[PDB]
Short mmCIF file of C-alpha atoms and ligand atoms in Angstrom, two decimals:
data_model
loop_
_atom_site.label_atom_id
_atom_site.label_comp_id
_atom_site.label_asym_id
_atom_site.label_seq_id
_atom_site.Cartn_x
_atom_site.Cartn_y
_atom_site.Cartn_z
CA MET J 126 -0.41 0.32 0.52
CA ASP J 127 1.72 3.44 -1.53
CA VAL J 128 2.40 5.68 2.13
CA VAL J 129 0.82 9.24 2.39
CA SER J 130 0.40 11.52 5.01
CA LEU J 131 -2.81 12.59 5.50
CA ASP J 132 -4.72 15.25 8.13
CA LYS J 133 -8.33 13.60 8.01
CA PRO J 134 -10.29 11.33 5.72
CA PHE J 135 -12.53 12.08 3.31
CA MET J 136 -15.66 11.77 4.92
CA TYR J 137 -18.24 13.02 2.82
CA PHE J 138 -18.13 12.70 -1.48
CA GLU J 139 -17.99 16.10 -2.10
CA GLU J 140 -14.78 15.98 -0.38
CA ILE J 141 -13.09 13.30 -2.67
CA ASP J 142 -10.80 15.70 -4.78
CA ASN J 143 -9.96 13.60 -8.17
CA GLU J 144 -11.49 10.89 -10.16
CA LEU J 145 -10.45 7.95 -12.27
CA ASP J 146 -11.32 6.07 -14.92
CA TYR J 147 -13.63 2.76 -13.94
CA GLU J 148 -12.53 -0.95 -14.68
CA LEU J 149 -12.82 -8.76 6.80
CA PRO J 150 -15.00 -11.44 8.46
CA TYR J 151 -18.98 -9.97 9.05
CA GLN J 152 -17.22 -6.84 7.06
CA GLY J 153 -20.83 -5.38 6.45
CA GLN J 154 -22.31 -5.51 9.78
CA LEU J 155 -19.14 -3.30 11.04
CA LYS J 156 -19.58 -0.85 7.74
CA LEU J 157 -23.31 -0.66 8.79
CA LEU J 158 -22.29 -0.36 12.51
CA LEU J 159 -19.85 2.09 11.99
CA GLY J 160 -22.18 4.80 9.67
CA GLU J 161 -24.84 4.86 12.39
CA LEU J 162 -22.89 5.34 14.88
CA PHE J 163 -21.86 8.44 13.24
CA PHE J 164 -25.26 9.05 12.53
CA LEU J 165 -26.83 8.96 15.37
CA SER J 166 -23.68 10.42 17.95
CA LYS J 167 -24.74 13.39 14.89
CA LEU J 168 -27.96 13.77 16.52
CA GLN J 169 -27.28 13.48 20.13
CA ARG J 170 -24.80 15.90 19.67
CA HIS J 171 -27.67 18.14 18.20
CA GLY J 172 -29.53 17.74 21.40
CA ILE J 173 -32.43 15.48 19.11
CA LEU J 174 -31.72 12.06 19.33
CA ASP J 175 -32.83 11.44 22.60
CA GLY J 176 -36.52 11.16 23.49
CA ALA J 177 -36.57 9.88 19.63
CA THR J 178 -37.80 6.50 18.29
CA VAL J 179 -35.67 5.36 15.61
CA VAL J 180 -37.80 3.51 12.61
CA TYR J 181 -35.29 1.21 10.66
CA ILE J 182 -36.52 -0.14 7.42
CA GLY J 183 -35.06 -3.33 6.20
CA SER J 184 -32.88 -4.46 9.62
CA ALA J 185 -32.84 -8.06 9.22
CA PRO J 186 -30.51 -10.07 9.94
CA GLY J 187 -29.77 -6.64 12.26
CA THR J 188 -26.69 -7.96 14.26
CA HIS J 189 -24.95 -4.91 14.59
CA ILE J 190 -28.12 -3.15 15.50
CA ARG J 191 -27.44 -5.19 19.06
CA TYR J 192 -24.86 -2.90 19.68
CA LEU J 193 -26.05 0.11 18.49
CA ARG J 194 -28.68 0.39 21.59
CA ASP J 195 -26.57 -1.37 24.27
CA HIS J 196 -24.54 1.77 22.98
CA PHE J 197 -27.36 4.53 23.59
CA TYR J 198 -29.20 2.69 26.72
CA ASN J 199 -25.59 2.71 28.74
CA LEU J 200 -25.25 6.22 27.53
CA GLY J 201 -29.21 7.25 29.22
CA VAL J 202 -30.55 8.15 25.62
CA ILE J 203 -34.15 7.33 25.42
CA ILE J 204 -34.78 5.50 22.55
CA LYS J 205 -37.40 3.26 21.39
CA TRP J 206 -36.69 1.29 18.08
CA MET J 207 -38.81 -0.51 15.85
CA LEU J 208 -37.18 -2.76 13.75
CA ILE J 209 -39.85 -3.64 10.16
CA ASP J 210 -38.16 -6.17 7.55
CA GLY J 211 -39.91 -9.43 6.10
CA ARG J 212 -37.11 -11.30 6.74
CA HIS J 213 -36.07 -12.59 10.37
CA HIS J 214 -33.83 -10.70 12.46
CA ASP J 215 -31.28 -11.71 14.38
CA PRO J 216 -32.02 -13.87 17.74
CA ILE J 217 -29.15 -11.42 19.51
CA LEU J 218 -32.12 -8.55 19.34
CA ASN J 219 -34.30 -10.85 21.26
CA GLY J 220 -35.59 -10.16 25.10
CA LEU J 221 -35.17 -6.41 24.78
CA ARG J 222 -38.31 -3.78 25.84
CA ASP J 223 -37.28 -0.56 23.93
CA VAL J 224 -36.75 -2.61 20.46
CA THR J 225 -39.65 -3.26 18.13
CA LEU J 226 -39.21 -6.44 16.20
CA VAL J 227 -41.67 -6.67 13.25
CA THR J 228 -42.12 -9.30 10.52
CA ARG J 229 -43.26 -7.27 7.50
CA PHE J 230 -42.36 -5.40 4.24
CA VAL J 231 -43.45 -1.81 4.28
CA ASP J 232 -45.53 -0.35 1.74
CA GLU J 233 -47.31 3.13 1.70
CA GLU J 234 -50.59 1.91 3.12
CA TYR J 235 -48.52 0.31 6.38
CA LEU J 236 -46.23 3.48 6.74
CA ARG J 237 -49.42 5.69 7.03
CA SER J 238 -50.22 3.53 10.00
CA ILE J 239 -47.05 3.59 11.96
CA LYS J 240 -46.85 7.19 11.20
CA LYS J 241 -50.43 7.45 13.61
CA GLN J 242 -49.28 5.35 16.05
CA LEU J 243 -45.76 7.08 17.40
CA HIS J 244 -47.15 10.80 16.38
CA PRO J 245 -46.44 12.91 17.47
CA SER J 246 -42.80 11.20 18.78
CA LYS J 247 -40.15 12.08 16.99
CA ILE J 248 -38.87 9.92 14.43
CA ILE J 249 -35.54 9.18 12.87
CA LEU J 250 -35.40 6.82 10.05
CA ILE J 251 -33.04 4.38 8.83
CA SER J 252 -33.50 2.59 5.42
CA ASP J 253 -31.82 -0.31 4.35
CA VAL J 254 -33.87 -1.74 1.89
CA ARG J 255 -32.81 -3.38 -0.99
CA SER J 256 -34.52 -5.40 -3.75
CA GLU J 257 -27.57 -7.72 -8.32
CA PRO J 258 -29.61 -5.44 -8.59
CA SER J 259 -31.51 -3.26 -11.51
CA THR J 260 -31.91 0.06 -12.01
CA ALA J 261 -35.17 -0.41 -12.03
CA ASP J 262 -34.88 -1.72 -8.50
CA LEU J 263 -32.80 0.87 -7.43
CA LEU J 264 -35.04 3.24 -8.60
CA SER J 265 -38.12 1.44 -7.11
CA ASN J 266 -35.89 1.35 -3.83
CA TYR J 267 -35.22 4.87 -3.36
CA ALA J 268 -38.96 5.63 -4.70
CA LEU J 269 -39.95 4.19 -1.56
CA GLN J 270 -37.52 5.81 0.62
CA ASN J 271 -38.97 9.08 -0.83
CA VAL J 272 -42.10 7.88 0.03
CA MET J 273 -41.07 6.43 3.64
CA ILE J 274 -39.80 10.51 4.58
CA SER J 275 -42.98 11.91 2.90
CA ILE J 276 -45.18 10.47 5.17
CA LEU J 277 -42.90 9.15 8.22
CA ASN J 278 -41.93 12.80 8.04
CA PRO J 279 -38.57 11.93 10.42
CA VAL J 280 -36.69 14.37 12.14
CA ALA J 281 -33.62 12.78 10.39
CA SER J 282 -33.15 10.12 8.16
CA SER J 283 -30.08 8.08 6.70
CA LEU J 284 -30.76 6.91 3.29
CA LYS J 285 -28.99 3.64 1.37
CA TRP J 286 -27.80 5.71 -1.06
CA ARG J 287 -25.85 4.08 -4.34
CA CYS J 288 -26.43 6.19 -7.88
CA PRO J 289 -27.89 3.39 -10.41
CA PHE J 290 -24.72 3.55 -13.23
CA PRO J 291 -23.98 5.33 -16.36
CA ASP J 292 -24.47 2.85 -18.70
CA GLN J 293 -27.62 1.50 -16.84
CA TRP J 294 -29.31 4.81 -16.61
CA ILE J 295 -33.47 4.34 -17.72
CA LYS J 296 -34.09 8.28 -16.55
CA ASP J 297 -33.56 11.07 -13.76
CA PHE J 298 -34.81 10.44 -10.80
CA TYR J 299 -35.16 12.57 -7.26
CA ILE J 300 -33.74 11.84 -3.90
CA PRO J 301 -33.33 14.21 -0.73
CA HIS J 302 -31.08 16.62 0.09
CA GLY J 303 -28.23 15.32 2.65
CA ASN J 304 -24.64 14.88 3.14
CA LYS J 305 -23.15 12.02 1.60
CA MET J 306 -21.53 10.22 3.87
CA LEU J 307 -18.94 7.77 2.99
CA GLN J 308 -18.67 4.02 4.55
CA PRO J 309 -15.39 2.38 5.92
CA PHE J 310 -15.08 -1.26 5.25
CA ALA J 311 -17.32 -1.31 2.18
CA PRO J 312 -16.69 -4.08 -0.06
CA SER J 313 -13.59 -3.19 -2.08
CA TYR J 314 -15.29 -1.13 -5.04
CA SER J 315 -18.66 -0.68 -3.53
CA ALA J 316 -20.14 2.97 -4.74
CA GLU J 317 -22.69 3.31 -1.98
CA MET J 318 -23.09 6.03 0.87
CA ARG J 319 -25.31 6.70 3.52
CA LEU J 320 -27.37 10.01 2.48
CA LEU J 321 -28.17 11.84 5.63
CA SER J 322 -30.01 14.27 6.39
CA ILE J 323 -31.43 16.95 9.05
CA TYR J 324 -35.17 18.15 8.28
CA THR J 325 -35.60 22.38 9.57
CA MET J 326 -37.86 17.94 2.11
CA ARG J 327 -36.87 19.40 -0.81
CA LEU J 328 -35.90 16.42 -3.51
CA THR J 329 -32.71 16.68 -5.86
CA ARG J 330 -32.73 15.65 -9.61
CA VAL J 331 -29.93 12.91 -9.76
CA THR J 332 -28.47 13.10 -14.31
CA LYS J 333 -26.81 10.09 -16.25
CA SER J 334 -23.74 12.90 -15.63
CA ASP J 335 -24.14 12.65 -11.99
CA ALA J 336 -23.62 8.49 -12.09
CA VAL J 337 -20.90 8.81 -14.22
CA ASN J 338 -19.18 11.76 -11.46
CA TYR J 339 -20.06 9.24 -9.03
CA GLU J 340 -18.66 6.23 -10.32
CA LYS J 341 -15.32 7.86 -11.59
CA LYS J 342 -15.35 9.76 -7.80
CA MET J 343 -16.04 6.24 -6.00
CA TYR J 344 -13.63 4.28 -8.29
CA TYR J 345 -10.68 6.51 -7.18
CA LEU J 346 -11.26 6.60 -3.66
CA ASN J 347 -11.96 2.38 -3.98
CA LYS J 348 -8.46 1.90 -6.27
CA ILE J 349 -6.32 4.53 -4.66
CA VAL J 350 -7.72 6.24 -1.85
CA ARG J 351 -8.63 3.46 0.53
CA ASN J 352 -5.22 1.32 -0.52
CA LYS J 353 -2.76 4.00 1.05
CA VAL J 354 -0.85 3.75 4.57
CA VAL J 355 -1.66 6.86 6.32
CA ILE J 356 2.31 7.00 7.88
CA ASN J 357 1.50 10.01 10.00
CA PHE J 358 -1.38 8.17 11.80
CA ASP J 359 -0.89 7.56 15.30
CA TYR J 360 -3.14 4.26 15.92
CA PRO J 361 -1.90 0.36 15.57
CA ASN J 362 -3.39 0.43 11.89
CA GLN J 363 -2.78 2.59 9.50
CA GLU J 364 -4.39 1.57 6.83
CA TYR J 365 -7.18 4.41 4.92
CA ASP J 366 -10.26 2.07 6.22
CA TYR J 367 -8.84 2.47 9.54
CA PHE J 368 -7.78 5.96 9.72
CA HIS J 369 -11.30 6.85 8.11
CA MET J 370 -13.25 4.82 10.85
CA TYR J 371 -10.92 6.69 13.52
CA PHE J 372 -12.41 10.14 12.24
CA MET J 373 -15.85 8.67 12.95
CA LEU J 374 -15.85 7.21 16.34
CA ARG J 375 -14.53 10.32 17.74
CA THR J 376 -17.59 11.83 17.30
CA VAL J 377 -19.29 8.93 19.61
CA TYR J 378 -19.78 9.80 23.06
CA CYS J 379 -18.88 7.15 26.25
CA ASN J 380 -19.92 7.48 29.50
CA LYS J 381 -16.00 6.27 30.08
CA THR J 382 -13.57 8.51 30.36
CA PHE J 383 -10.14 8.08 28.63
CA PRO J 384 -6.50 9.74 29.66
CA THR J 385 -6.43 10.28 25.50
CA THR J 386 -8.55 10.58 22.70
CA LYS J 387 -6.46 7.23 20.69
CA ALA J 388 -7.19 5.42 24.24
CA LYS J 389 -10.93 6.22 23.14
CA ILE J 390 -11.04 5.54 20.07
CA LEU J 391 -8.83 1.96 20.65
CA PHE J 392 -11.90 1.18 23.25
CA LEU J 393 -14.31 1.82 20.98
CA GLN J 394 -13.05 0.17 18.22
CA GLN J 395 -11.70 -3.26 20.06
CA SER J 396 -15.26 -3.52 21.71
CA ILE J 397 -17.38 -3.53 18.06
CA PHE J 398 -14.20 -5.95 16.92
CA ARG J 399 -14.97 -7.86 19.52
CA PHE J 400 -18.93 -8.17 19.80
CA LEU J 401 -18.83 -8.14 15.95
CA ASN J 402 -16.23 -11.56 16.30
CA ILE J 403 -13.24 -9.64 14.04
CA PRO J 404 -9.62 -10.19 15.55
N1 LIG A 506 -40.58 -2.95 1.65
C1 LIG A 506 -39.45 -3.24 3.00
N2 LIG A 506 -40.11 -3.35 3.89
C2 LIG A 506 -39.22 -3.84 4.87
N3 LIG A 506 -37.47 -4.18 4.60
C3 LIG A 506 -37.71 -4.22 2.99
C4 LIG A 506 -38.31 -4.27 2.10
C5 LIG A 506 -38.07 -4.83 0.56
C6 LIG A 506 -38.35 -4.97 0.11
C7 LIG A 506 -39.61 -4.54 -1.16
C8 LIG A 506 -40.29 -4.74 -2.21
C9 LIG A 506 -39.41 -5.23 -3.78
N4 LIG A 506 -40.31 -5.66 -4.97
C10 LIG A 506 -41.71 -4.89 -5.10
C11 LIG A 506 -42.28 -5.05 -6.28
C12 LIG A 506 -42.92 -4.48 -6.26
C13 LIG A 506 -43.81 -4.11 -5.08
C14 LIG A 506 -43.55 -3.88 -3.94
C15 LIG A 506 -42.29 -3.84 -4.12
C16 LIG A 506 -41.31 -4.67 -2.59
C17 LIG A 506 -36.57 -5.03 0.90
N5 LIG A 506 -36.46 -5.17 2.53
C18 LIG A 506 -35.45 -5.84 3.21
O1 LIG A 506 -34.46 -4.78 3.31
C19 LIG A 506 -33.36 -5.88 3.87
C20 LIG A 506 -32.19 -5.63 3.02
S1 LIG A 506 -30.69 -6.00 3.15
C21 LIG A 506 -30.39 -5.25 5.02
C22 LIG A 506 -29.32 -5.44 6.21
C23 LIG A 506 -29.45 -4.78 7.83
N6 LIG A 506 -29.35 -3.27 7.21
C24 LIG A 506 -28.45 -5.13 8.58
O2 LIG A 506 -28.29 -5.35 9.76
O3 LIG A 506 -28.28 -6.52 8.25
C25 LIG A 506 -33.41 -7.40 4.10
O4 LIG A 506 -33.73 -7.75 4.96
C26 LIG A 506 -35.11 -7.37 2.84
O5 LIG A 506 -36.04 -8.03 3.55
#
């Protein structure tokens, strides 16, 4: 891995500054865990996480969700979880009074009913629904996610967001405004990000040129940037994905006090890796 000296990783898609012509055990739960720890910790910093209800759609099996709860439960943050998926969840999510497990595929009619029963409590939406997928599969998925937002009207949302490839384009479509969070420990050449939005919902047109810009920017990220060793980075592992993870984890709150910031991140990573069974 070519060596590089960095002050900070790319945290959002907008920060990628170059492009290139495209050509771990249970790493997926680690990717989801970090991005949802990042998203929800940002909400905690804005003081809006607390007293909210997290509605997670497409949450199965959702092993990592157990860590997310226990984290905020041990911080004393009052959160109710509603996990809705047609597939069965990981049994490790059983027996938690503040976690509601719902076995159901969501449609417009059912989003209306859960809004009725949760209203007027703050809703935080996390969607990871997926129906390899075609561009029509994605367009329907993103349509459904817009429908989640227009009905549930969450105070914030994290949405699965991967632009359709330019050579499989169909039509321009619309997605919410928000910050496109980059995911460490994503698959080697995935172009998926998490659309993070805090609502104070204006839709944005996505064009075939955007798809080209996504494809080239994310390829440069996956081919060049993520294959670097950050030699100035004071950490047991200096591979970029760990440098990236380190900057996400420093936004996380802990009840425990640590002598240094590096000590905190090391503790959190050990905790996350141990629960996810990662050496
Ligand atoms: N509507 C929904 N509501 C809830 N969950 C849904 C869906 C859905 C769909 C659909 C669909 C497909 N064709 C249609 C055709 C016509 C009309 C309507 C149609 C709807 C998929 N999912 C779940 O998304 C997860 C992705 S992996 C998450 C992994 C998870 N993030 C983790 O922690 O591991 C899977 O578990 C999957 O079961």
